[PDB]
Amino acid sequence: DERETWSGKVDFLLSVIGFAVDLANVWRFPYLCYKNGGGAFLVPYGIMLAVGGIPLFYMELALGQHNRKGAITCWGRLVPLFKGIGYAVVLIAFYVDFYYNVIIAWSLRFFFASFTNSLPWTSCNNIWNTPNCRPFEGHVEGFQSAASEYFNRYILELNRSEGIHDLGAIKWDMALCLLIVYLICYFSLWKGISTSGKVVWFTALFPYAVLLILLIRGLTLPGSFLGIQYYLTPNFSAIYKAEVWVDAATQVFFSLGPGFGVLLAYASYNKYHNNVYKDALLTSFINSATSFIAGFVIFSVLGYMAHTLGVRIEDVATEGPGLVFVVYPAAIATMPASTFWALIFFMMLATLGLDSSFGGSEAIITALSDEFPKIKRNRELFVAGLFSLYFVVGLASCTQGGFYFFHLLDRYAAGYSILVAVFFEAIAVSWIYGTNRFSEDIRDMIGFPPGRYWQVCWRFVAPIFLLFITVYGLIGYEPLTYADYVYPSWANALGWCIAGSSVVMIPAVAIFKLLSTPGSLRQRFTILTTPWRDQQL
Amino acid sequence: EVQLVESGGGLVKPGGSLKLSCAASGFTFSSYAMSWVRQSPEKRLEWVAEISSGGRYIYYSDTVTGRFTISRDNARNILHLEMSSLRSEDTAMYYCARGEVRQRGFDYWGQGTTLTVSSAKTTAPSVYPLAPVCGDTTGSSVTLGCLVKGYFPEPVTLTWNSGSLSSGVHTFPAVLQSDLYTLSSSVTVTSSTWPSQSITCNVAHPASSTKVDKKIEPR
Amino acid sequence: ENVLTQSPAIMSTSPGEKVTMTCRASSSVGSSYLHWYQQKSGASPKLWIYSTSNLASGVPARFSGSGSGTSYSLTISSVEAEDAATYYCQQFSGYPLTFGSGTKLEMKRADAAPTVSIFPPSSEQLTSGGASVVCFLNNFYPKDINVKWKIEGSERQNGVLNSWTDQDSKDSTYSMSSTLTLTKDEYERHNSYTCEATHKTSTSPIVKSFNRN
Ligand SMILES: CC(C)CCC[C@@H](C)[C@H]1CC[C@H]2[C@@H]3CC=C4C[C@@H](OC(=O)CCC(=O)O)CC[C@]4(C)[C@H]3CC[C@]12C
Ligand SMILES: CC(C)CCC[C@@H](C)[C@H]1CC[C@H]2[C@@H]3CC=C4C[C@@H](O)CC[C@]4(C)[C@H]3CC[C@]12C
Ligand SMILES: OC[C@H]1O[C@H](O[C@H]2[C@H](O)[C@@H](O)[C@@H](O)O[C@@H]2CO)[C@H](O)[C@@H](O)[C@@H]1O
Ligand SMILES: *[C@@H]1O[C@H](CO)[C@@H](O)[C@H](O)[C@H]1NC(C)=O
Ligand SMILES: C[C@H](N)Cc1ccccc1
Ligand SMILES: [Cl-]
Ligand code: NA
Ligand code: NA
């Protein structure tokens, strides 16, 4: 204080909704519903949302609004022994920027690709095609669809790479798209939230315009009801299995943003007596509701593919990049006015990703802006240096073998790491700092204590929720592979480095902080577990 | 159930200092924020200070800030208001009040404890019988009276026949005049009842250790 | 500081009648932050209506509350004698927390004339050097009444103390005590003492008096 504040509350809400709603709302939630008993999946999903996701989501938002600092300073002021959590969270967000932007660039690349009266990925008689190409998805690996070969052999040129050891030529048309993304991010974030919170009005709202248009074209298609059937038809037999609850737990956790320091930074610009609890609920709800909607958008079209284009539903119903960059564009191309559906689809994909990259970077800038007045004074300079380091290292993912690089980070950069970070975040808040202090902090802000429900969830449910995900994510571990390629053991260990490079800050910094403090070790856990709020009276 | 008990009030000279206390019980005192609210002799309610459930957030009215200090003993369940350089404007009944939710208000209150800030010295009342004039019965009933004059500070305890006689009793609130309260009571009983049976006005003023009784005879 | 002004200040009502009372803030108050307390005579305040509309525990359905921004109101749909008290509104939208100035609610009833009585100084007091005549005026309605002392036929205005009781919870009447104090020397320098109460019930003042036998 003085600390800059949101130019208006809608800016905050859209920044948060924009961060939380991204591509996985489209390319994973509907797939999980289809795979796990249809609308029955909503039960495990809703329970995980209620006892795990939203409480963690609420917590970080309240915590950021109360302590009014970014992730490093905040965790340091709250429990100095764990200042490292702020460092861990910061460079997890740092790694994620190295690859996640590439998805946006692919979106722009397909967008620039659809300025035409006849979409390229339609047919199997192009220079990049293979003797084995089919018009649509099949179930035999050696025979790709026309859209799959376009993505793979034309956009990516992934066929020309023999692995992560063979990144090949830089692909400048991609680097151009990667640069445009970073320019859009720079001129969105250099001036701070005064413009960043205005930009999100587009990037957070645009997808809903397109979701509506596609939802109508989708549901008017022949076979669209058949798709909705595959999407939502209940089968509670799935609920019996542990793997389904783990799928719900993990989806809930990664879909909401909790513990990345992003919600922390955004809430840190809230007015102190803002009703952060009302904001956390409205915001959670919109995230999940968007996934629900998008599922109709996807499977109406997926149903139209099965009914009309003559393809097994199981072959087109898929997750991840393949759904949005291959299967959906395939369906679009068969439709009248296809060029229009393609241009707004790929635009939606990019705006879906942009709000999210915004939040990741802001978690970083705000964290560093608060630790270091040097960079806070020079924001417009600092981000330019940061996005420059992004663009340069990111050129690796614009190479012909670039997917192999993307896929490596996508697995190791944030996955296992953030779960342990958030696990200590929960443990720090509820048990070191105390739910008592926290509840009291929340009342001083919003006028009432959190219910015993939110308290039980933070203290008990949350940590074993995160524990539940982390353990099944270990027991299910296998060495990294993509399609027929298997990554070399050194590549595997290198990702373990990226994974532990951040997690290690937690015990590292705890060890280093102990060795600058005067007293005996009973005396020293106390000096490092006493909150900054209390030392200053 | 829930009970709050303020204590510690009494006469204090200006500039002096005193410590009020509130004994919480019947609920989990650690969980709730507490406030001191005072009521002046002119019956105005004025919030004084609020302390957090954990005692880490303290607010004061501008009237008492830098003079009062609110405190909290969560182990022994006792709320505290530590006053200093008191002044006559601080004279009031002080209430201790539960108030953890702002959206819900002060849901429970104590019975209050009275602060009086004055330069006046404590002095014992003279109690005078009020027997009726010469003649002139009657009168289905008769009125008797009692005069508690010249005391300070408030309170005094008046009753009749040690409280057996509560019907027909009017006990007037005291009125300060040049640093001395004067008070009076009237009681009416059927003409058969008096002077056939003794009617005593019994008065208590603990601040001055007084304990008078006054039988009323028609001299 | 958000001043809350309440009107009316005092309010008389027949049982069964509707009553409304209002609260005006000098600044906007969120409706979830406006509350009301009732405080019966001689007792602590009780929470009563919280965040505008919400009856507190044990509060009979007669009560209701309404308002927003800078204007709020309490309404009793059909008043009962047990409802006579002072009502205070309050905000928590901002520190310092502030209470309203009060609306004292009171029972209307049919008029009743005072039962005046006059008392000469007690012998215990005259020996003290003092002398206070006393004149009780009991069980009348409405509350307004005007006592007037006379030595001889001359009125005396100086040196008086008047006390009024709170309205009776039983018969809902008012009572008053007037004490005229003199030096014993002034009391003995003269013979006739009178105390007379003009009141609405009668155009003629009600008069009690005594000579020194
Ligand atoms: C499928 C999509 C379109 C909707 C997703 C459903 C969720 C938005 C719903 C289902 C379960 C709901 C929860 C059901 C039980 C409650 C208890 C409720 O408890 C309290 O009132 C706390 C006390 C306080 O106010 O402090 C808080 C909301 C919550 C967690 C709900 C949060 C919203 C939830 C997650
Ligand atoms: C896609 C179709 C089916 C549904 C469209 C959903 C749209 C209209 C919904 C979803 C999220 C909503 C927004 C969520 C955030 C706010 C904050 C609030 O203070 C103003 C309204 C506003 C801006 C909402 C406007 C309407 C909104 C954009
Ligand atoms: O969608 C195919 C369409 O454009 C292609 O041109 C490329 C261009 O060569 C690249 O440099 C890129 O940046 O822009 C286009 C992306 O597709 C074909 O060359 C063109 O004939 C065709 O219409
Ligand atoms: C299709 O039309 C677009 C104009 O929208 C043009 O750019 C493109 O070159 C056309 N394709 C062919 C094969 O001519
Ligand atoms: C929670 C978002 N859906 C995923 C994300 C994206 C970028 C950074 C962090 C997290
Ligand atoms: Cl989701
Ligand atoms: Na999401
Ligand atoms: Na987004």
Give a short summary of the structure.
The complex is a heterotrimer of chains A (537), B (219) and C (213). Chain A is mostly helical and 537 residues long.
What does it look like?
The complex is a heterotrimer of chains A (537), B (219) and C (213). With 537 residues, chain A is mostly helical. Chain A has one domain. Helix content of chain A is 71%, strand content 1%. Chain A has a two-stranded antiparallel sheet. In chain A, strand 1 and strand 2 form a beta hairpin. Chain B is mainly β. Chain B has two domains: 119 residues, Immunoglobulins (Immunoglobulin-like, Sandwich), CATH 2.60.40.10; 100 residues, Immunoglobulins (Immunoglobulin-like). In chain B, 0% of the residues lie in helices and 45% in strands. Chain B is built from no helices and 18 strands. In chain B, strands 2, 4, 5, 6, 9, 10 and 11 form a seven-stranded mixed sheet that branches. In chain B, strands 1-3-8-7 form a four-stranded antiparallel sheet, with no helix packed on it. In chain B, strands 12-13-16-15 form a four-stranded antiparallel sheet, with no helix packed on it. In chain B, strand 5 and strand 6 form a beta hairpin. Chain C has 213 residues and is mainly β. Chain C has two domains: 109 residues, Immunoglobulins (Immunoglobulin-like), CATH 2.60.40.10; 102 residues, Sandwich (Immunoglobulin-like). Chain C is 4% helix and 52% strand. In chain C, strands 2, 4, 5, 6, 9, 10 and 11 form a seven-stranded mixed sheet that branches. A four-stranded antiparallel sheet of chain C has the order 1-3-8-7, with no helix packed on it. Cholesterol binds next to helix 1, helix 10 and helix 14 of chain A. Chain A: This is Transporter. Chain A: Belongs to the sodium:neurotransmitter symporter (SNF) (TC 2.A.22) family. Chain A: It is found in: Cell membrane. Chain A: InterPro entries: Na/ntran_symport, SNS_sf. Chain A: Keywords: Cell membrane, Disulfide bond, Glycoprotein, Membrane, Metal-binding, Neurotransmitter transport, Sodium, Symport, Transmembrane, Transmembrane helix, Transport.
